[PDB]
Subunit: 115 residues, 4 copies
Protein backbone atom coordinates (compact mmCIF):
# COMPACT_ATOMS: atom_id res chain seq x y z
CA UNK A 1 0.00 0.00 0.00
CA UNK A 2 2.13 2.89 -1.30
CA UNK A 3 -0.57 5.54 -0.76
CA UNK A 4 -2.97 5.78 2.17
CA UNK A 5 -5.16 8.69 3.27
CA UNK A 6 -6.47 9.19 6.81
CA UNK A 7 -9.10 11.81 7.63
CA UNK A 8 -10.09 13.01 11.12
CA UNK A 9 -13.00 15.14 12.33
CA UNK A 10 -12.00 17.94 14.74
CA UNK A 11 -15.62 18.78 15.65
CA UNK A 12 -16.80 15.35 16.71
CA UNK A 13 -13.47 13.84 17.78
CA UNK A 14 -13.83 10.88 15.48
CA UNK A 15 -12.46 9.48 12.26
CA UNK A 16 -14.11 11.18 9.31
CA UNK A 17 -16.09 8.23 7.94
CA UNK A 18 -17.42 7.84 4.37
CA UNK A 19 -15.45 10.82 3.08
CA UNK A 20 -15.05 10.63 -0.69
CA UNK A 21 -11.83 11.61 -2.38
CA UNK A 22 -10.40 11.60 -5.89
CA UNK A 23 -6.73 11.25 -6.80
CA UNK A 24 -5.38 12.76 -10.02
CA UNK A 25 -2.00 12.61 -11.72
CA UNK A 26 -0.63 15.39 -13.91
CA UNK A 27 -0.40 14.26 -17.53
CA UNK A 28 2.28 15.21 -20.05
CA UNK A 29 0.02 17.99 -21.37
CA UNK A 30 -0.28 19.52 -17.85
CA UNK A 31 -3.86 18.27 -17.42
CA UNK A 32 -5.11 16.35 -14.39
CA UNK A 33 -5.78 12.72 -15.30
CA UNK A 34 -8.00 10.57 -13.04
CA UNK A 35 -5.81 8.17 -11.07
CA UNK A 36 -7.89 6.58 -8.27
CA UNK A 37 -10.76 7.32 -5.93
CA UNK A 38 -12.49 5.90 -2.87
CA UNK A 39 -14.19 6.60 0.45
CA UNK A 40 -12.79 6.44 3.97
CA UNK A 41 -13.69 3.48 6.18
CA UNK A 42 -15.03 3.51 9.75
CA UNK A 43 -11.41 4.13 10.81
CA UNK A 44 -11.23 7.22 8.61
CA UNK A 45 -8.71 5.48 6.36
CA UNK A 46 -8.68 4.83 2.64
CA UNK A 47 -6.38 1.95 1.67
CA UNK A 48 -5.74 0.22 -1.63
CA UNK A 49 -5.84 3.28 -3.90
CA UNK A 50 -2.86 2.09 -5.96
CA UNK A 51 -0.02 -0.42 -6.33
CA UNK A 52 3.75 -0.08 -6.38
CA UNK A 53 3.77 -0.75 -10.13
CA UNK A 54 1.10 1.83 -10.97
CA UNK A 55 2.29 4.57 -8.58
CA UNK A 56 5.07 5.96 -10.77
CA UNK A 57 6.91 9.28 -10.45
CA UNK A 58 4.61 12.20 -11.01
CA UNK A 59 2.70 15.11 -9.58
CA UNK A 60 -0.40 13.87 -7.76
CA UNK A 61 -3.43 15.67 -6.35
CA UNK A 62 -5.69 14.26 -3.64
CA UNK A 63 -9.00 16.13 -3.60
CA UNK A 64 -10.97 15.28 -0.44
CA UNK A 65 -14.70 16.04 -0.64
CA UNK A 66 -14.96 17.82 2.69
CA UNK A 67 -17.98 19.87 1.59
CA UNK A 68 -20.31 16.87 1.27
CA UNK A 69 -19.08 15.55 4.62
CA UNK A 70 -19.97 18.73 6.49
CA UNK A 71 -23.24 19.26 4.61
CA UNK A 72 -24.40 15.78 5.62
CA UNK A 73 -23.92 16.85 9.25
CA UNK A 74 -25.97 20.01 8.66
CA UNK A 75 -22.93 22.31 8.55
CA UNK A 76 -22.28 24.77 5.73
CA UNK A 77 -18.48 24.67 5.47
CA UNK A 78 -15.99 27.08 3.97
CA UNK A 79 -13.99 24.90 1.57
CA UNK A 80 -15.14 23.10 -1.55
CA UNK A 81 -12.59 20.37 -0.80
CA UNK A 82 -9.25 19.86 0.91
CA UNK A 83 -6.52 19.55 -1.71
CA UNK A 84 -3.06 17.97 -1.38
CA UNK A 85 -0.70 18.34 -4.37
CA UNK A 86 2.74 16.73 -4.28
CA UNK A 87 5.50 15.14 -6.32
CA UNK A 88 5.79 11.42 -5.56
CA UNK A 89 8.54 8.85 -6.06
CA UNK A 90 11.01 11.14 -7.79
CA UNK A 91 13.91 9.59 -5.82
CA UNK A 92 12.60 6.04 -6.02
CA UNK A 93 9.56 4.34 -4.52
CA UNK A 94 8.24 5.66 -1.22
CA UNK A 95 5.19 4.94 0.92
CA UNK A 96 2.94 7.94 1.55
CA UNK A 97 0.39 8.52 4.27
CA UNK A 98 -1.59 11.72 3.76
CA UNK A 99 -3.52 12.84 6.83
CA UNK A 100 -6.13 15.59 7.02
CA UNK A 101 -7.78 17.05 10.14
CA UNK A 102 -11.08 18.73 9.26
CA UNK A 103 -13.10 21.59 10.73
CA UNK A 104 -15.89 23.56 9.03
CA UNK A 105 -13.68 26.60 8.31
CA UNK A 106 -10.23 25.03 8.54
CA UNK A 107 -8.13 22.04 7.73
CA UNK A 108 -4.65 20.79 8.51
CA UNK A 109 -2.83 18.25 6.39
CA UNK A 110 0.48 16.46 6.72
CA UNK A 111 2.40 13.68 5.02
CA UNK A 112 4.42 10.78 6.38
CA UNK A 113 6.90 9.56 3.75
CA UNK A 114 8.75 6.32 4.41
CA UNK A 115 11.31 4.29 2.49
Amino acid sequence: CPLMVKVLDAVRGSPAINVAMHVFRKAADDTWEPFASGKTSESGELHGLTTEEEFVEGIYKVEIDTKSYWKALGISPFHEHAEVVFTANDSGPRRYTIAALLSPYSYSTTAVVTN
Copy 2:
Protein backbone atom coordinates in the same frame (compact mmCIF):
# COMPACT_ATOMS: atom_id res chain seq x y z
CA CYS B 1 -10.53 44.46 2.44
CA PRO B 2 -12.63 41.92 0.50
CA LEU B 3 -9.88 39.28 0.32
CA MET B 4 -6.65 39.16 2.33
CA VAL B 5 -4.21 36.26 2.70
CA LYS B 6 -1.85 35.87 5.66
CA VAL B 7 0.98 33.32 5.62
CA LEU B 8 3.01 32.18 8.64
CA ASP B 9 6.18 30.07 8.91
CA ALA B 10 5.98 27.32 11.56
CA VAL B 11 9.69 26.45 11.28
CA ARG B 12 11.11 29.92 11.92
CA GLY B 13 8.27 31.48 13.94
CA SER B 14 7.86 34.40 11.57
CA PRO B 15 5.59 35.78 8.89
CA ALA B 16 6.25 34.05 5.59
CA ILE B 17 7.57 36.95 3.49
CA ASN B 18 7.69 37.14 -0.31
CA VAL B 19 5.38 34.15 -0.76
CA ALA B 20 3.83 34.24 -4.23
CA MET B 21 0.25 33.23 -4.92
CA HIS B 22 -2.33 33.32 -7.70
CA VAL B 23 -6.10 33.47 -7.25
CA PHE B 24 -8.41 31.86 -9.81
CA ARG B 25 -12.18 31.83 -10.25
CA LYS B 26 -13.97 28.81 -11.67
CA ALA B 27 -15.45 29.48 -15.11
CA ALA B 28 -18.70 28.09 -16.48
CA ASP B 29 -16.72 25.38 -18.33
CA ASP B 30 -15.08 24.27 -15.03
CA THR B 31 -11.72 25.79 -16.01
CA TRP B 32 -9.81 28.08 -13.65
CA GLU B 33 -9.84 31.70 -14.85
CA PRO B 34 -7.12 34.09 -13.61
CA PHE B 35 -8.53 36.46 -11.00
CA ALA B 36 -5.84 38.06 -8.80
CA SER B 37 -2.28 37.54 -7.60
CA GLY B 38 0.54 38.94 -5.50
CA LYS B 39 3.29 38.27 -2.98
CA THR B 40 3.16 38.53 0.80
CA SER B 41 4.65 41.60 2.46
CA GLU B 42 7.14 41.71 5.33
CA SER B 43 4.15 41.10 7.63
CA GLY B 44 3.27 37.92 5.76
CA GLU B 45 0.12 39.57 4.40
CA LEU B 46 -1.22 40.12 0.90
CA HIS B 47 -3.81 42.91 0.70
CA GLY B 48 -5.43 44.60 -2.27
CA LEU B 49 -6.19 41.44 -4.26
CA THR B 50 -9.65 42.58 -5.37
CA THR B 51 -12.41 45.12 -4.79
CA GLU B 52 -15.90 44.57 -3.45
CA GLU B 53 -17.51 45.23 -6.86
CA GLU B 54 -15.27 42.75 -8.69
CA PHE B 55 -15.50 39.99 -6.06
CA VAL B 56 -18.86 38.32 -6.70
CA GLU B 57 -20.24 34.83 -6.24
CA GLY B 58 -17.98 32.10 -7.51
CA ILE B 59 -15.69 29.29 -6.57
CA TYR B 60 -12.22 30.71 -5.92
CA LYS B 61 -8.86 28.98 -5.61
CA VAL B 62 -5.88 30.55 -3.86
CA GLU B 63 -2.76 28.70 -5.01
CA ILE B 64 0.17 29.56 -2.74
CA ASP B 65 3.67 28.73 -4.03
CA THR B 66 4.96 27.16 -0.84
CA LYS B 67 7.49 25.05 -2.75
CA SER B 68 9.53 28.06 -3.87
CA TYR B 69 9.42 29.43 -0.32
CA TRP B 70 10.95 26.29 1.20
CA LYS B 71 13.44 25.80 -1.62
CA ALA B 72 14.77 29.32 -1.00
CA LEU B 73 15.53 28.14 2.56
CA GLY B 74 17.30 24.99 1.36
CA ILE B 75 14.40 22.74 2.40
CA SER B 76 12.89 20.11 0.12
CA PRO B 77 9.15 20.35 0.90
CA PHE B 78 6.33 17.90 0.34
CA HIS B 79 3.73 20.03 -1.44
CA GLU B 80 3.87 21.64 -4.85
CA HIS B 81 1.70 24.40 -3.41
CA ALA B 82 -0.93 25.04 -0.76
CA GLU B 83 -4.35 25.53 -2.24
CA VAL B 84 -7.51 26.90 -0.69
CA VAL B 85 -10.72 26.37 -2.70
CA PHE B 86 -13.95 27.99 -1.49
CA THR B 87 -17.23 29.51 -2.61
CA ALA B 88 -17.35 33.23 -1.86
CA ASN B 89 -20.09 35.88 -1.89
CA ASP B 90 -22.96 33.44 -2.43
CA SER B 91 -24.97 35.40 0.18
CA GLY B 92 -23.71 38.75 -1.07
CA PRO B 93 -20.44 40.47 -0.17
CA ARG B 94 -18.33 39.23 2.70
CA ARG B 95 -14.79 40.03 3.78
CA TYR B 96 -12.46 37.04 3.73
CA THR B 97 -9.16 36.50 5.51
CA ILE B 98 -7.41 33.29 4.50
CA ALA B 99 -4.59 32.24 6.81
CA ALA B 100 -2.01 29.54 6.05
CA LEU B 101 0.54 28.14 8.51
CA LEU B 102 3.38 26.43 6.65
CA SER B 103 5.75 23.58 7.50
CA PRO B 104 7.87 21.57 5.04
CA TYR B 105 5.57 18.51 5.11
CA SER B 106 2.36 20.09 6.35
CA TYR B 107 0.12 23.09 6.14
CA SER B 108 -2.86 24.35 8.08
CA THR B 109 -5.36 26.86 6.76
CA THR B 110 -8.36 28.66 8.17
CA ALA B 111 -10.75 31.37 7.07
CA VAL B 112 -12.27 34.31 8.88
CA VAL B 113 -15.44 35.48 7.13
CA THR B 114 -17.02 38.75 8.26
CA ASN B 115 -20.14 40.61 7.20
Copy 3:
Protein backbone atom coordinates in the same frame (compact mmCIF):
# COMPACT_ATOMS: atom_id res chain seq x y z
CA CYS C 1 3.49 44.83 22.10
CA PRO C 2 5.68 42.39 24.07
CA LEU C 3 3.02 39.67 24.28
CA MET C 4 -0.21 39.40 22.28
CA VAL C 5 -2.54 36.41 21.95
CA LYS C 6 -4.88 35.91 18.99
CA VAL C 7 -7.62 33.26 19.07
CA LEU C 8 -9.62 32.01 16.06
CA ASP C 9 -12.71 29.79 15.82
CA ALA C 10 -12.41 27.01 13.21
CA VAL C 11 -16.10 26.02 13.50
CA ARG C 12 -17.64 29.43 12.82
CA GLY C 13 -14.85 31.06 10.77
CA SER C 14 -14.54 34.02 13.11
CA PRO C 15 -12.33 35.52 15.76
CA ALA C 16 -12.93 33.81 19.09
CA ILE C 17 -14.34 36.69 21.15
CA ASN C 18 -14.46 36.93 24.95
CA VAL C 19 -12.05 34.03 25.43
CA ALA C 20 -10.52 34.21 28.90
CA MET C 21 -6.90 33.33 29.60
CA HIS C 22 -4.33 33.56 32.38
CA VAL C 23 -0.56 33.82 31.93
CA PHE C 24 1.80 32.33 34.51
CA ARG C 25 5.57 32.44 34.95
CA LYS C 26 7.46 29.50 36.42
CA ALA C 27 8.91 30.27 39.85
CA ALA C 28 12.22 29.01 41.23
CA ASP C 29 10.33 26.26 43.11
CA ASP C 30 8.73 25.05 39.83
CA THR C 31 5.32 26.46 40.79
CA TRP C 32 3.33 28.65 38.40
CA GLU C 33 3.23 32.29 39.56
CA PRO C 34 0.43 34.57 38.28
CA PHE C 35 1.76 36.95 35.64
CA ALA C 36 -0.98 38.43 33.42
CA SER C 37 -4.52 37.77 32.23
CA GLY C 38 -7.39 39.04 30.11
CA LYS C 39 -10.11 38.24 27.60
CA THR C 40 -9.99 38.45 23.82
CA SER C 41 -11.58 41.46 22.11
CA GLU C 42 -14.08 41.44 19.24
CA SER C 43 -11.07 40.90 16.95
CA GLY C 44 -10.07 37.78 18.87
CA GLU C 45 -6.98 39.55 20.20
CA LEU C 46 -5.67 40.19 23.69
CA HIS C 47 -3.17 43.07 23.86
CA GLY C 48 -1.61 44.86 26.81
CA LEU C 49 -0.74 41.76 28.84
CA THR C 50 2.68 43.03 29.93
CA THR C 51 5.35 45.65 29.31
CA GLU C 52 8.86 45.21 27.98
CA GLU C 53 10.44 45.96 31.38
CA GLU C 54 8.28 43.43 33.24
CA PHE C 55 8.61 40.65 30.65
CA VAL C 56 12.03 39.11 31.32
CA GLU C 57 13.53 35.65 30.90
CA GLY C 58 11.36 32.87 32.20
CA ILE C 59 9.16 29.97 31.30
CA TYR C 60 5.65 31.26 30.63
CA LYS C 61 2.35 29.41 30.35
CA VAL C 62 -0.68 30.86 28.58
CA GLU C 63 -3.73 28.91 29.76
CA ILE C 64 -6.69 29.65 27.47
CA ASP C 65 -10.16 28.71 28.77
CA THR C 66 -11.40 27.05 25.61
CA LYS C 67 -13.86 24.88 27.55
CA SER C 68 -16.00 27.84 28.63
CA TYR C 69 -15.93 29.16 25.06
CA TRP C 70 -17.35 25.95 23.58
CA LYS C 71 -19.82 25.42 26.41
CA ALA C 72 -21.28 28.88 25.75
CA LEU C 73 -22.00 27.62 22.20
CA GLY C 74 -23.66 24.43 23.44
CA ILE C 75 -20.68 22.27 22.43
CA SER C 76 -19.08 19.72 24.74
CA PRO C 77 -15.35 20.08 23.96
CA PHE C 78 -12.45 17.74 24.55
CA HIS C 79 -9.92 19.98 26.30
CA GLU C 80 -10.12 21.63 29.69
CA HIS C 81 -8.04 24.45 28.21
CA ALA C 82 -5.44 25.14 25.56
CA GLU C 83 -2.04 25.77 27.03
CA VAL C 84 1.08 27.22 25.46
CA VAL C 85 4.30 26.83 27.47
CA PHE C 86 7.47 28.54 26.25
CA THR C 87 10.70 30.19 27.35
CA ALA C 88 10.69 33.90 26.55
CA ASN C 89 13.34 36.64 26.53
CA ASP C 90 16.29 34.31 27.10
CA SER C 91 18.23 36.30 24.47
CA GLY C 92 16.85 39.62 25.68
CA PRO C 93 13.53 41.22 24.75
CA ARG C 94 11.47 39.87 21.90
CA ARG C 95 7.90 40.54 20.81
CA TYR C 96 5.67 37.46 20.91
CA THR C 97 2.40 36.79 19.13
CA ILE C 98 0.76 33.53 20.18
CA ALA C 99 -2.03 32.36 17.89
CA ALA C 100 -4.51 29.58 18.68
CA LEU C 101 -7.01 28.06 16.24
CA LEU C 102 -9.80 26.28 18.13
CA SER C 103 -12.06 23.34 17.32
CA PRO C 104 -14.11 21.29 19.80
CA TYR C 105 -11.71 18.31 19.77
CA SER C 106 -8.56 19.98 18.51
CA TYR C 107 -6.42 23.06 18.68
CA SER C 108 -3.48 24.40 16.72
CA THR C 109 -1.08 27.01 18.01
CA THR C 110 1.86 28.90 16.58
CA ALA C 111 4.16 31.69 17.64
CA VAL C 112 5.58 34.66 15.79
CA VAL C 113 8.71 35.97 17.53
CA THR C 114 10.17 39.27 16.35
CA ASN C 115 13.23 41.25 17.38
Copy 4:
Protein backbone atom coordinates in the same frame (compact mmCIF):
# COMPACT_ATOMS: atom_id res chain seq x y z
CA CYS D 1 -5.51 0.07 25.13
CA PRO D 2 -7.73 2.90 26.39
CA LEU D 3 -5.13 5.64 25.81
CA MET D 4 -2.73 5.92 22.88
CA VAL D 5 -0.65 8.89 21.74
CA LYS D 6 0.65 9.39 18.20
CA VAL D 7 3.19 12.09 17.35
CA LEU D 8 4.14 13.27 13.84
CA ASP D 9 6.97 15.48 12.59
CA ALA D 10 5.87 18.21 10.14
CA VAL D 11 9.46 19.17 9.23
CA ARG D 12 10.76 15.76 8.21
CA GLY D 13 7.48 14.13 7.16
CA SER D 14 7.94 11.21 9.50
CA PRO D 15 6.63 9.81 12.74
CA ALA D 16 8.22 11.60 15.67
CA ILE D 17 10.30 8.75 17.08
CA ASN D 18 11.64 8.45 20.65
CA VAL D 19 9.56 11.38 21.90
CA ALA D 20 9.17 11.22 25.67
CA MET D 21 5.92 12.11 27.36
CA HIS D 22 4.48 12.10 30.86
CA VAL D 23 0.83 11.64 31.77
CA PHE D 24 -0.57 13.14 34.97
CA ARG D 25 -3.94 12.90 36.68
CA LYS D 26 -5.41 15.66 38.83
CA ALA D 27 -5.60 14.57 42.47
CA ALA D 28 -8.31 15.46 44.98
CA ASP D 29 -6.15 18.34 46.26
CA ASP D 30 -5.90 19.83 42.71
CA THR D 31 -2.28 18.70 42.31
CA TRP D 32 -0.97 16.78 39.30
CA GLU D 33 -0.17 13.18 40.26
CA PRO D 34 2.12 11.08 38.03
CA PHE D 35 0.02 8.59 36.09
CA ALA D 36 2.15 7.03 33.31
CA SER D 37 5.00 7.83 30.95
CA GLY D 38 6.77 6.44 27.92
CA LYS D 39 8.44 7.14 24.59
CA THR D 40 7.05 6.90 21.07
CA SER D 41 8.06 3.94 18.90
CA GLU D 42 9.39 3.97 15.33
CA SER D 43 5.76 4.45 14.27
CA GLY D 44 5.47 7.56 16.42
CA GLU D 45 3.01 5.76 18.69
CA LEU D 46 3.00 5.16 22.43
CA HIS D 47 0.81 2.21 23.44
CA GLY D 48 0.22 0.52 26.76
CA LEU D 49 0.22 3.60 28.98
CA THR D 50 -2.72 2.34 31.06
CA THR D 51 -5.47 -0.26 31.46
CA GLU D 52 -9.26 -0.06 31.51
CA GLU D 53 -9.25 -0.67 35.27
CA GLU D 54 -6.67 2.01 36.07
CA PHE D 55 -7.95 4.68 33.64
CA VAL D 56 -10.78 6.00 35.82
CA GLU D 57 -12.73 9.24 35.45
CA GLY D 58 -10.53 12.25 35.98
CA ILE D 59 -8.72 15.20 34.50
CA TYR D 60 -5.58 14.05 32.70
CA LYS D 61 -2.62 15.93 31.27
CA VAL D 62 -0.31 14.57 28.58
CA GLU D 63 2.93 16.55 28.51
CA ILE D 64 4.93 15.73 25.36
CA ASP D 65 8.64 16.61 25.55
CA THR D 66 8.83 18.36 22.19
CA LYS D 67 11.78 20.52 23.27
CA SER D 68 14.21 17.61 23.63
CA TYR D 69 13.03 16.20 20.29
CA TRP D 70 13.81 19.39 18.38
CA LYS D 71 17.06 20.06 20.25
CA ALA D 72 18.34 16.60 19.29
CA LEU D 73 17.83 17.61 15.65
CA GLY D 74 19.76 20.84 16.20
CA ILE D 75 16.65 23.04 16.28
CA SER D 76 15.91 25.51 19.06
CA PRO D 77 12.11 25.29 19.32
CA PHE D 78 9.54 27.63 20.79
CA HIS D 79 7.62 25.42 23.22
CA GLU D 80 8.83 23.70 26.37
CA HIS D 81 6.38 20.87 25.66
CA ALA D 82 3.06 20.23 23.96
CA GLU D 83 0.33 19.86 26.57
CA VAL D 84 -3.06 18.15 26.27
CA VAL D 85 -5.44 18.48 29.25
CA PHE D 86 -8.82 16.75 29.18
CA THR D 87 -11.53 15.09 31.25
CA ALA D 88 -11.69 11.36 30.54
CA ASN D 89 -14.34 8.70 31.07
CA ASP D 90 -16.89 10.93 32.77
CA SER D 91 -19.74 9.26 30.82
CA GLY D 92 -18.31 5.76 31.07
CA PRO D 93 -15.21 4.14 29.59
CA ARG D 94 -13.94 5.46 26.27
CA ARG D 95 -10.86 4.82 24.15
CA TYR D 96 -8.72 7.89 23.48
CA THR D 97 -6.19 8.51 20.74
CA ILE D 98 -4.31 11.79 21.22
CA ALA D 99 -2.43 12.93 18.13
CA ALA D 100 0.09 15.77 17.90
CA LEU D 101 1.68 17.24 14.76
CA LEU D 102 4.92 19.05 15.62
CA SER D 103 6.85 21.95 14.11
CA PRO D 104 9.57 24.04 15.78
CA TYR D 105 7.25 27.02 16.46
CA SER D 106 3.86 25.32 16.26
CA TYR D 107 1.86 22.27 17.10
CA SER D 108 -1.57 20.90 16.34
CA THR D 109 -3.30 18.32 18.49
CA THR D 110 -6.55 16.41 18.19
CA ALA D 111 -8.37 13.59 19.93
CA VAL D 112 -10.29 10.61 18.61
CA VAL D 113 -12.73 9.34 21.25
CA THR D 114 -14.47 6.03 20.64
CA ASN D 115 -16.95 3.94 22.59
